[PDB]
Structure 1
Amino acid sequence: GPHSMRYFETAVSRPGLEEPRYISVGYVDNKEFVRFDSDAENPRYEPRAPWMEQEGPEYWERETQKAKGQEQWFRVSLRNLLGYYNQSAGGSHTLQQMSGCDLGSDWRLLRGYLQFAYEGRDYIALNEDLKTWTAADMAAQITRRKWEQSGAAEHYKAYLEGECVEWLHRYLKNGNATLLRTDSPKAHVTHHPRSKGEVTLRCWALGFYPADITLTWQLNGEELTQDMELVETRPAGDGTFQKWASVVVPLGKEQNYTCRVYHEGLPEPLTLRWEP
């Protein structure tokens, strides 16, 4: 029973637009719970799960001012980065940030996170020690030296060990019914004839949460990389997820094939096969 919190932040500059659009999204255990967007009429952080309406107006006023601060920080940084990469006016650019904490099932901090990307690529990141920085790009070295000289790492470390953990604990108590549960996958196999003397067996899994899942096919023993087709896990749109995996099989010898579904809601892996 581990836990996590993240804020995913994005600022996008576009050619003629006056100034960048800034979006921040907060997540508790990988579920969205707050959101700010500078394109709204009255830009404010907003609840995105029912359990967050417990928070009084001082919570929302403070987080909103923080967001407006972040917006200005991303605006100046975008400007600085344009100069660092000798990019000219008239293009589109992106600055992103992930930050947050992971807790063990004892609710102790497992790991802190602080990373940035520019144009969708690693720019700079705080290492797991919460003291040193990784920056690959020559242009990013300028930021690394600046942040090393100002003691930025100490500032982010205090947030990640302090507030991030403290307020995550408070959120986990407040939403203890909503995001404790999981939905087990319900699975079935469909049959689909094809090119003479062969058929595809499609193993479906439906209605599961969270998204993490594995579907394997077995020829009475070993797995199958031998053209096992599959799809990426996809949202149903109602909070659950879907996935399938398939394998080409001789017609008649289809009961030598078994599909297994591995999901954290299951008491044990499901085993399954085609049934007329």
Structure 2
Amino acid sequence: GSHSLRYFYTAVSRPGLGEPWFIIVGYVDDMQVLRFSSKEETPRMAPWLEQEEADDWEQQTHIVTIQGQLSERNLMTLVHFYNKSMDDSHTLQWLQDCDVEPDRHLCLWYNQLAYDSEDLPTLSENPSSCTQHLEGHCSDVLQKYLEKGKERLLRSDPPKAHVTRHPRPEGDVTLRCWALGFYPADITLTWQKDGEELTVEFVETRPAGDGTFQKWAAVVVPLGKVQSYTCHVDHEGLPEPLTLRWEP
């Protein structure tokens, strides 16, 4: 069970009418831990955590401010290289971070950039593991965060499911299975019919707004053979697989 800590980076160019901007985000798994904008005075750190009383986000803050100011000198010269005339607006997005874990022993450092939504070469590989260089405090800062917010981070929130019927004019009903409250965003929602998997409409998993997630699976069933259908819910937070046959 390893954990992640990736930083996001969005820089936008403002052609000769001021300057470009940016805004980085900090994610420790499926949780937003940090936020920071152009010329802001300090990054936004999740309250739930143990909140810096001497918590070395001073480390993070330094790195982000000096690393975030590498848009106006990474974008600009990137709009200059490509010669897309520095008249329109263009964007570059930087992303780093790792996926550590001690007891399993192993690191992994990440770093790729994209110009106007296209992968640019960085020459460094990808599985290149790891330990004035944020690439050295990755696993460290990571093993700190988990200690500041062990209630959300080290936390597996199970889903609450419930189906819903919508018998339509034509004579066909549509059965939809819902999955709410869960953390993390990995879940495997399926619809079947006597053990057989219906090889079914649905939605990408989406944010509820507080930390939990949502999603639903759907099929148009002939109103009469709807008791032979069932929906399974599997998540890391559940003790045993879920087989809700229309909510009983």
Do they fold alike, i.e. is TM over 0.5? yes
Q: Give 1:234's aligned residue.
A: 206
2:76 match? 79
Rounded Cα–Cα distance in structure 2 between residues aligned with 1:23 and 1:52: 24
State the match for 2:44 in structure 1.
46
Amino acid at match of 2:2: P
Q: Would the aligned equivalents of 1:214 and 1:261 in 2 still touch at CA under 8 Å?
A: yes
Most deviating of 197-206 and 67-76: 67-76
Tell me the C-alpha RMSD between the 2 structures.
2.4
Q: Which amino acid aligns with 2:212?
A: T
Bigger relative contact order, structure 1 or 2 (CA pairs below 8 A, ≥6 apart): 2
Residues of 1 paired with 2:56 and 2:215: CA distance? 42
Partner of 1:116: 113
CA deviation string 1:121-173 (max 9, x = no partner): 21134312539xxxxxxxxxxxxxxxxxxxxxxx9xx743x311122112222
Pair 111,67 (structure 1): closer, same or farther in 2 beyond 3 Å: closer
CA distance in structure 2 between the aligned counterparts of 1:4 and 1:71, rounded to whole angstroms: 20
Counterpart-to-counterpart distance in 1, 2:109 and 2:29: 14
Matches within 5 A, 1:175-254: 175-225=149-199, 228-254=200-226
Task: Give distance in 1, aligned partners of 2:218 and 2:55.
Answer: 51
For residues 58 and 219 of structure 1, what CA distance do their matches in structure 2 show?
54
Partner of 1:167: 141
Identify unmatched segments of 5+ residues in structure 2: none
Q: Deviations over 1:84-128 (max 9, x none)?
A: 211112211111111111023726334211111111221134312
The answer on whether the counterparts of 2:30 and 2:185 sit within 8 Å (CA) in structure 1 is no
| 1:66 maps onto 2:40 in alignment | no
Equivalent residue number for residue 147 of structure 1: none
What is residue 89 of structure 1 aligned with on the other side?
86
Cα distance change, pair 106–55 in 1 and its aligned pair in 2 (3 A): farther
Aligned equivalents of 2:217 and 2:166: distance in 1? 13
Q: CA deviation at 1:215?
A: 1.1
- Paired residues in the alignment total 246
Give the letter for the 1:264 counterpart: E
Matched residue type, 2:185: A
- Matched position secondary structure for 1:200: strand
Shift of 1:262: 1.5
**SS in structure 1 opposite 2:196?**
coil
What is aligned with 1:20? Answer: 20
User: Does residue 23 of structure 2 align to residue 9 of structure 1?
Assistant: no
Quick check: 1:266 aligned with 2:233? no
**Structure 1: 5+ residue runs without aligned partners?**
132-154
- Residue 199 (structure 1) shift: 0.7
TM-score, length of structure 1 as denominator length: 0.80
Deviation at 1:52, TM superposition (A): 5.1
Name the CA shift for 1:267/1:248 in 2 (closer, same or farther; >3 Å): same
Alpha-carbon separation, structure 1, partners of 2:95 and 2:240: 34
The change in CA–CA distance for 1:57 and 1:4 in structure 2 (over 3 A counts) is closer
Which amino acid is the alignment partner of residue 210 of structure 2?
Answer: D
Q: Partner of 2:158: helix, strand, or coil?
A: coil
Measured after TM superposition, the shift of residue 7 of structure 1 is: 0.8
Contact kept in structure 2, 1:12 and 1:95, CA below 8 Å: yes
In structure 2, relative to structure 1, the CA distance for the partners of 1:107 and 1:175 (3 Å cut) is farther
